[PDB]
């Protein structure tokens, strides 16, 4: 599941990414830090 900036991951976000918001349900939406 993509996320405005990156991708969604259940649990949280890869150290690289930034939590943009919630993903489908219990999942977390992650985007890239460039501006997050």
Curated annotation (Swiss-Prot):
Keyword annotations: Antibiotic, Antimicrobial, Defensin, Disulfide bond, Secreted, Signal
Record has Ion transport as a keyword: no
GO function terms (MF aspect): CCR6 chemokine receptor binding; chemoattractant activity
Tissue specificity as recorded in UniProt: Expressed in circulating heterophil granulocytes and bone marrow (at protein level). Strong expression in the bone marrow, lung and testis. Moderate expression in the bursa and intestine. Low expression in the cloaca, gall bladder, brain, pancreas, trachea, air sacs and spleen. Expressed in the vagina, ovarian stroma and the theca layer of the ovarian follicle, but not in the granulosa layer of the ovarian follicle.
Residues of the full protein shown: 29 to 64 of 64
Main subcellular location of this protein, as a coarse class: secreted
GO CC field: extracellular space; secretory granule
Induction text: Not induced in the ovarian follicle by intravenous injection of LPS. Expression in cultured vaginal cells is increased by LPS and S.enteritidis.
Similarity remark: Belongs to the beta-defensin family.
Subcellular localization: Secreted; Cytoplasmic granule
Gene Ontology annotations of biological process type: cell chemotaxis; defense response; defense response to bacterium
Full protein name: Gallinacin-2
Species whose genome carries this gene: Gallus gallus
Disulfide topology: 3-29, 8-23, 13-30
Biological role stated in the UniProt entry: Potent antibacterial activity against the Gram-negative bacterium E.coli ML-35, and against the Gram-positive bacterium L.monocytogenes EGD. Lacks antifungal activity against C.albicans.
């Amino acid at each position: 599941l993509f996320c405005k900036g990156g991708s969604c991951h259940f649990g949280g976000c890869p150290s690289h990414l930034i939590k943009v918001g919630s993903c489908f349900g219990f999942r977390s939406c992650c985007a890239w830090p460039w501006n997050a």
